[PDB]
Amino acid sequence: ELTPDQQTLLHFIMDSYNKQRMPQEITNKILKEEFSAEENFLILTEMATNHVQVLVEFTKKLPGFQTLDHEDQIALLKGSAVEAMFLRSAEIFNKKLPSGHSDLLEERIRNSGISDEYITPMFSFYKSIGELKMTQEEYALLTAIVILSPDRQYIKDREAVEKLQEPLLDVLQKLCKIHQPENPQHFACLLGRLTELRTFNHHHAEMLMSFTPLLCEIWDV
Numbered sequence: 001e002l003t004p005d006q007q008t009l010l011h012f013i014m015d016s017y018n019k020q021r022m023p024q025e026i027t028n029k030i031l032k033e034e035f036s037a038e039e040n041f042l043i044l045t046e047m048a049t050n051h052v053q054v055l056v057e058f059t060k061k062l063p064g065f066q067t068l069d070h071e072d073q074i075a076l077l078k079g080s081a082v083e084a085m086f087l088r089s090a091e092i093f094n095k096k097l098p099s100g101h102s103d104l105l106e107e108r109i110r111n112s113g114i115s116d117e118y119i120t121p122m123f124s125f126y127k128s129i130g131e132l133k134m135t136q137e138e139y140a141l142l143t144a145i146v147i148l149s150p151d152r153q154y155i156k157d158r159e160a161v162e163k164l165q166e167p168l169l170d171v172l173q174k175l176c177k178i179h180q181p182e183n184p185q186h187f188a189c190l191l192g193r194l195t196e197l198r199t200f201n202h203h204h205a206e207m208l209m210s211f212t213p214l215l216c217e218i219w220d221v
């Protein structure tokens with residue numbers, strides 16, 4: 001069902017998606033026998049910095065992204081960093097772990113210097129989106145779609161972003177039909193999550209209200 005053009009777009013995206021730290025690289029670090037809230041916060045700051053570094057690089061390689069106006073490119077990166085981080089956290093969180101460990105993961109993140117006001121919403125999101133049983137390809141495409149969002153603040157040429165976003169949505173809709181052929185609702189389910197992710201922008205802003213040179217550059221703190 002993917003056209004040849006679509007197959008190659010997907011392939012370039014998965015090549016670049018596959019350069020991130022594996023879920024266990026992240027999750028082994030938090031779950032190790034020796035734990036403190038203090039080192040775990042520093043640990044999370046490091047992981048957030050690497051996530052942004054890897055996202056920056058993902059935008060260099062994302063087909064068409066570097067044909068955009070340079071200022072718009074930076075604005076898309078800054079407008080999408082936090083949403084991208086939470087989506088990847090959902091993907092990571094839903095990967096199988098040894099006995100007791102997903103419970104342990106959640107409890108440590110809950111005792112890392114950040115209040116329950118933020119943490120509870122975020123784990124409900126991870127578990128809910130987890131029940132959709134998205135493939136790696138769906139996560140990758142939905143990430144690209146988040147980044148190429150024409151309605152971000154400060155974009156000068158919104159039509160230019162739209163022209164790259166629409167082909168990605170077309171690919172995603174095919175992937176949903178390929179991967180869950182008996183679930184006609186799937187694509188609409190993922191459209192929903194596009195909007196739900198945006199709620200995290202406010203929480204994170206709040207959370208920070210209560211860092212590394214890259215995070216200072218991209219989060220603007």
Ligand SMILES: CC(C)OC(=O)C1=CN(C(=O)c2ccc(F)c(F)c2)CC(C)(C)c2c1[nH]c1ccccc21
Nearest residue numbers: 026027044045047048049051085088089092093109
């Ligand atoms: C691994 C990448 C994709 O994600 C992270 O970096 C974040 C992960 N976050 C997760 O919840 C997360 C982290 C690790 C996991 F293994 C997981 F399943 C979920 C969220 C948050 C807000 C706790 C956090 C994130 N980083 C923070 C930095 C400072 C302060 C807070 C954070």
